[PDB]
């Protein structure tokens, strides 16, 4: 499965100018394009080499789409003040995420097209891609308007058409980058705590794709809530990073072992304090 998703944000700032507007596009867990109204040059920009192969028509077209969206969101921020009857001097946020998850074989799995206002669900297109779920009173007003206007129909056309077709194109043109495999490097580090015991930290870095399994075992038994497992996140070079730590008794670290599983490894990697 693969995905093409766009994360959009509009943040008003009364007294500081027009709302800040941003768009970030991702193929799976990798950003490849972005738009920021506050950038040195406010237009669509590549964020990965493989997308740079797209001609000028692509950048001017996406730039136009982004600026058109920006105007739409400016209007939406004003309307929202009215729906919620809020003061006109405060800052507010409108968020939107749309995209498609496609089956291992160019078959659409799920479509997304949802909004949030001031960090809370506002309205979202249901899985049938034909109906809307409004989270509150105000969103109910938007829903009625979109049903009468036929918004879903056009939105679905994007998800089932453009979103799917372009993702296929992106996966092909960016194959060397998007479908590559960078093996993880792993380490275990040893820090004595002030309380007298020891914190063992298992590192996993420089890997791609993001999916990875990192765990601590005690006497060959996987630990769960007893260890601290942070979520994996990106590094600056397009790879990912993760780590897990466990507090163990001073003198008993030979009993703890860290396990790493990743498609970039030929077999699970087991490490110990060293």
């Amino acid at each position: 499965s693969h995905s093409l998703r766009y994360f959009v944000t509009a943040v008003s700032r009364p007294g500081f100018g027009e709302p800040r507007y941003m768009e970030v596009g991702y193929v799976d867990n990798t950003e490849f394009v972005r738009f920021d109204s506050d950038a040195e040059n406010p237009r669509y920009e590549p964020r990965a080499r493989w997308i740079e192969q797209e001609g000028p028509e692509y950048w001017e077209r996406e730039t136009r789409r982004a600026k058109g969206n920006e105007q739409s969101f400016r209007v939406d921020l004003r309307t929202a003040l009215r729906y919620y009857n809020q003061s006109a001097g405060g800052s507010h946020t409108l968020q939107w995420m749309a995209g498609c998850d496609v089956e291992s074989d160019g078959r659409l799995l799920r479509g997304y097209w949802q909004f949030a206002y001031d960090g809370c669900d506002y309205i979202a297109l249901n899985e049938d891609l034909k109906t809307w779920t409004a989270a509150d009173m105000a969103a109910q007003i938007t829903r009625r308007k979109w049903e009468q206007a036929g918004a879903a129909e056009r939105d679905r056309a994007y998800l089932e058409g453009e979103c799917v077709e372009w993702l296929r194109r992106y996966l092909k043109n960016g194959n060397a980058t998007l479908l590559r495999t960078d093996p993880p490097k792993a380490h275990v580090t040893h820090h004595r705590r002030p309380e007298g015991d020891v914190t063992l930290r298992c590192w996993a870095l420089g890997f791609y794709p993001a999916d990875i399994t990192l765990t601590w075992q005690l006497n060959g038994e996987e630990l769960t809530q007893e260890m601290e497992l942070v979520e994996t996140r990106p590094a600056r070079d397009g790879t990912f990073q993760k780590w897990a730590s466990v507090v163990v008794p001073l003198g008993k670290e030979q009993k703890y072992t860290c396990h790493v599983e990743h498609e970039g490894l030929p077999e699970p990697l087991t490490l110990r304090w060293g």
Binding site: R13, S91, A116, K185, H191, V230, R233, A235, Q241
Partner: protein, 99 residues
């Protein structure tokens, strides 16, 4: 609704004196999106700091990564100071060189 940012400061790989590394300040779970992140070295702002383009999660909370190249030293202190509407005063998180 507002959400206070969770701050994580860590190096790319185990720190070793005289060996280049990358220091990270990963700020997540915050709202509103307006935020200021400053990576500091010995109480002084680091000039060359790059940040990823801000995005958000399923729960709609934002996140961003700040990073800079550095060579671990035995005594230099690194920190990430964050200012956000959710906090009355800036929040500073020190990097644990012994991680």
């Amino acid at each position: 609704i507002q959400k206070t940012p969770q701050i994580q400061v860590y190096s790319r790989h185990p720190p070793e004196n005289g060996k280049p590394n990358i220091l990270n300040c990963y700020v997540t779970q915050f709202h509103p999106p307006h935020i200021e992140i400053q990576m500091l070295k010995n109480g002084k702002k680091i000039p060359k700091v790059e940040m990823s383009d801000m995005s958000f999660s399923k729960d709609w909370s934002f996140y961003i990564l700040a990073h800079t190249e550095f060579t671990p030293t035995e005594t230099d202190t690194y920190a990430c100071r964050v200012k956000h509407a959710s906090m009355a005063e800036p929040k500073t998180v020190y990097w644990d060189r012994d991680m």
